Amino acid sequence: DLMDEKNSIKPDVIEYAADILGDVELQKELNSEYEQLVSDRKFLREIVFVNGDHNW
Amino acid sequence: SALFDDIFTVQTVDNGRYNKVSRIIGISTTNSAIKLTLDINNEMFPVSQDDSLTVTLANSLSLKSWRPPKPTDKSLADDYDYVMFGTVYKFEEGDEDKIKVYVSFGGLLMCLEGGYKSLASLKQDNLYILIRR
Amino acid sequence: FLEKYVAVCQEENYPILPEAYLVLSRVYENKDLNVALDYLMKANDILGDKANVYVLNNLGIYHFFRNNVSQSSDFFAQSLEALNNVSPQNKEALSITLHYNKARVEEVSNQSEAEKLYSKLMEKCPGYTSNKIRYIYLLALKSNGNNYADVQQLLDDFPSDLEVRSFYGWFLKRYGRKNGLKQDLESQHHKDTLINYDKHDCYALLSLGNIYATIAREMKVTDQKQNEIKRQQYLRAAQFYHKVLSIDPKNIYAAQGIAIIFSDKERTGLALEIFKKVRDTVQDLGTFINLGHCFMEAKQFGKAIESYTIALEKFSNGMDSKLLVLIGRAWYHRGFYEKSMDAYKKALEVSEQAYQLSKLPALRFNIVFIQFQIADFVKSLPNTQRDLTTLENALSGLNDAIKSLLKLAELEQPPYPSEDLKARATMGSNTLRNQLERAIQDQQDYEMSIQEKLRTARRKQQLDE
Amino acid sequence: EIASNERVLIDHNKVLRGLKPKDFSSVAKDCELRILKEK
Amino acid sequence: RQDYIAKVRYQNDLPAPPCPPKLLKYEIEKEAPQKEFLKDS
């Protein structure tokens, strides 16, 4: 989350932490990534591996 | 020269499975919350409970192939009774002031718990431990 | 041979002679107090009711050296009880010895009974020296060295006694300036002791070395000749210490003096090694203070902070102002060389605590200097590396520091000339004060821009949703 | 008689040793080579 | 040089003499009792 400060990337790990908060296009990109991850989770959990086995 | 120095009192000595190796646990006299778990060779540096040990950690013995030391040269190890050389394989930057350093002296393991200020300089690839008693 | 005899007797089931145990304990006195005490206990168990006064006294002394106060006291009580069975010829001497030992144990526990027994024995035997030495020493502790006449009289009584001379020299070193005596008077006394009584006494040699080092340190340096004379005095002190080491290489104080001389000679590494070895050997307040000083000279400010903290906690118990001053100086050095604000905050808090303990002009100036450095560093910091709260605290500290600078300039004998104090206050108020306000305005603008971005993003997100 | 019967556990020079003595012979040698022999 | 005020004085002061309790020599620490004990039949 690039809007809430305490739910963002830690500032000591990135050089550019100053000009990250408040950006909306980068938040759009991050939201697209997270939606892709959620879709992958749903696809794996409901179709491929119903019993939840994750070591393949 | 030396990256850490303190004096420890041995609380427990555990021989356990082995015959030539002992686990010793010590806490610093000048500063609690500093712990030392260590493997030592019994036959060369035997220790007993409630002993006082002067532990020093250095990144070099000065004042690549190993050679038997000439009697003429002098190094930092001349002042101590037990010197080991190992590699640091974990530097746990833990909680607010809880730092753990794991060092393996060829399979003989050491863990050093302490505050960040004391163990800040111990972020090295290899360390010598020098024990005096 | 005694161990072989013990083993043979044990194998033969024959009564082991306790005299062998006493001989073994006597030998182990100089090697292992633990083994000697164990052998003495075995001999006492063999004797049973045949225990003598000497065995009980030695057991009590062993436990006293082992800090076993209860067991030592019990053994001394048993020795006093057995004193009733002593032969009349040696009864007086053994009673005097046991009373002296009991008085020593009291002096450990309670000085009043020790002084009472000291008076009792002094009336019983005025010729004894250790009793008089301890009694006069306790009186000097109670009287803050107001019994110099008693010390001089005791010195006159036993001019050949090394203990009396050493105690008199210690009293001189303690209160020479209080008594207004000659600076070299103790030097002449120790020189006479060495030349005419014993030239191998390490006590007088160390005293002379300390005196010579003090003379060299106080000597003003103007050219090469004066520095060479200072080096010659240090060489005399070093020769005293080297003779002491030749007498005994296990002398911590000789090495400490050597390290101090090296510190005067800027040989920091040797002094650091010596101080580390000394700390490994013995742990007192002076060793920790010297270690902190060496770390400050070695630019290891964190280790200096640790050493000063340990010195404060272990011995001074957080009461001495000088250790707090040293901690504040070390914190300021760390903050200056490492550009750390938290070091400045801790130094400021330590200085404030020390001042509230003392309220002296020196600590007032220290607080002012810390606040000025804090304001300068905060102004030098970028906006992204600071916040409004730090700016406000720095500005308030700057105002208070200017007021205290004026207060110091109004004093009689300020630590620094009042003109310098007023000039520094004016310089801080003229430019630094306005730069602080400019930094505050820039920080406020930066925060406002951040909040504007944060409030603008959410509206567009809601519009998209 | 008191002096004859009196014995002191530790010597005047050895009082700094006590139960745990340590050696500064290397320190003495370094002092000789670097103070008395200092150039 | 208007800076932090601090005084440095190394502490190497010798302690006062301890005057510890004196050990008492055994009876077998004297030459005559030694002679009597060794010459026993």
Q: For residue C59, give the nearest of C21, C107, C87, C31 by alpha carbon.
A: C21
- Which residues sit directly before a break in chain B (C to N > 2.5 Å)? 63
Q: For residue C117, give the nearest of C103, C107, C131, C127 by alpha carbon.
A: C103
Rounded Cα distance between C25 and C13, Å, is 22
Q: Is B5 an interface residue toward C (CB < 8 Å)?
A: yes
Write down how long chain D is. 39
Q: What three-state secondary structure class fits B89?
A: strand
For residue B13, give the CATH number of its domain: 2.40.50.140
Cβ neighbors of C430 (< 8 A, separation 6 or more) are: none
- C chain contacts of residue A16, beta-carbon cutoff 8 Å: none
The burial class, CB within 10 Å (0-12 / 13-18 / 19+), for C307 is buried
Q: Is E25 an interface residue toward D (CB < 8 Å)?
A: yes
Q: Which chains touch C (3 or more CB pairs under 8 A)?
A: A, B, D, E
Q: Which helix (H) or strand (E) holds B127?
A: strand B126-132
Asked if C280 and B31 come within 8 Å (Cβ–Cβ), the reply is no
Interchain touch A–D (≥3 Cβ pairs closer than 8 Å): no
The burial class, CB within 10 Å (0-12 / 13-18 / 19+), for C150 is middle
Asked how this structure was determined, the answer is cryo-EM
Rounded Cα distance between C254 and D22, Å, is 13
Asked if C280 and B7 come within 8 Å (Cβ–Cβ), the reply is yes
Which of E7, E9, E13, E14 is most worth mutating to test chain C (most C CB atoms within 10 A of its CB)?
A: E14
Q: Is E37 an interface residue toward C (CB < 8 Å)?
A: yes
Encoded tokens for C139: 């009186």
DSSP-derived secondary structure letter, E15: P
Do C100 and C131 contact (CB within 8 A), yes or no? yes
Rounded Cα distance between B109 and C417, Å, is 60
Encoded tokens for D11: 């010597």
- B chain contacts of residue C277, beta-carbon cutoff 8 Å: 79
Which of A3, A23, A30 is most worth mutating to test chain C (most C CB atoms within 10 A of its CB)?
A: A3
Do B90 and B100 contact (CB within 8 A), yes or no? yes
CA dist A46 to A35, B29, C48, C280, C428, Å?
A: 16, 59, 88, 67, 70
Radius of gyration of chain C (CA): 32
Cβ neighbors of C347 (< 8 A, separation 6 or more) are: C327, C328, C329, C331, C332, C335, C370
Half-sphere exposure of residue C51: CA atoms within 13 angstroms, side-chain side: 22
Angle at B89 between CA B86 and CA B95, to 5 degrees: 125
Pairing status of strand B21-28 against strand B99-105: unpaired
Distance of CA B89 to the CA centre of its chain: 14
Q: Which residues of D lie closer than 8 Å to E, measured between beta carbons?
A: 4-10, 15
Do C437 and C399 contact (CB within 8 A), yes or no? no
Rounded Cα distance between C86 and C78, Å, is 13
Interchain touch C–D (≥3 Cβ pairs closer than 8 Å): yes
Cβ neighbors of C160 (< 8 A, separation 6 or more) are: C197
Count structural domains, chain B.
1
Q: Which helix (H) or strand (E) holds D28?
A: helix D25-31
Rounded Cα distance between C442 and C458, Å, is 25
The burial class, CB within 10 Å (0-12 / 13-18 / 19+), for C17 is middle
Rounded Cα distance between B115 and E13, Å, is 34
Q: Is C283 an interface residue toward A (CB < 8 Å)?
A: no
Do E2 and C424 contact (CB within 8 A), yes or no? yes
Rounded Cα distance between C20 and C15, Å, is 11
Rounded Cα distance between C198 and D13, Å, is 13
Half-sphere exposure of residue C237: CA atoms within 13 angstroms, side-chain side: 30
CA dist C305 to A36, C35, C259, Å?
A: 53, 41, 20
Measured in angstroms, the resolution is 3.1
Rounded Cα distance between E27 and C51, Å, is 12
CA dist C84 to A51, C50, C81, Å?
A: 93, 14, 6
Do A31 and A2 contact (CB within 8 A), yes or no? no
Pairing status of strand B126-132 against strand E23-24: unpaired
Q: What three-state secondary structure class fits E22?
A: coil
Structural domain including B31 reads 1-133
Q: Is B31 an interface residue toward C (CB < 8 Å)?
A: yes
SS (H, E, C) chain C: CHHHHHHHHHHHCCCCCHHHHHHHHHHHCCCCHHHHHHHHHHHHHHHHHHCCHHHHHHHHHHHHHCCCHHHHHHHHHHHHHHHHHCCHHHHHHHHHHHHHHHHHHHHHHCHHHHHHHHHHHHHHCCCCHHHHHHHHHHHHHHHCCCCHHHHHHHHHHCCCCHHHHHHHHHHHHHHHHHHCCCCCHHHHHHHHHHHHHCCCCHHHHHHHHHHHHHHHHHCCCCCHHHHHHHHHHHHHHHHHHHHHHHHCCCCHHHHHHHHHHHHHCCCHHHHHHHHHHHHHHCCCHHHHHHHHHHHHHCCCHHHHHHHHHHHHHHHHCCCCHHHHHHHHHHHHHHHHHHCCHHHHHHHHHHHHHHHHHHCCHHHHHHHHHHHHHHHHHHHHCCHHHCCHHHHHHHHHHHHHHHHHHHHHHCCCCCCCCHHHHHHHHHHHHHHHHHHHHHHHHHHHHHHHHHHHHHHHHHHHHHHHC
Do C453 and A21 contact (CB within 8 A), yes or no? yes
Q: What three-state secondary structure class fits B9?
A: strand
The minimal CB distance from B30 to the residues C276, C302, C310 is found for C310
Helix count (H) and strand count (E) of chain D? Answer: 2, 1
Cβ neighbors of C106 (< 8 A, separation 6 or more) are: C112, C113, C114, C117
Encoded tokens for A5: 């400060």
Rounded Cα distance between C326 and C332, Å, is 10
C242: number of Cβ within 10 Å? 20
- Which residues sit directly before a break in chain E (C to N > 2.5 Å)? none
Rounded Cα distance between C291 and C297, Å, is 10
Hey, which residues does B22 pair with through a beta bridge? B40
Q: Which spans in A1-56 are helix H?
A: 25-43
DSSP-derived secondary structure letter, D27: H
Angle at B61 between CA B58 and CA B63, to 5 degrees: 110
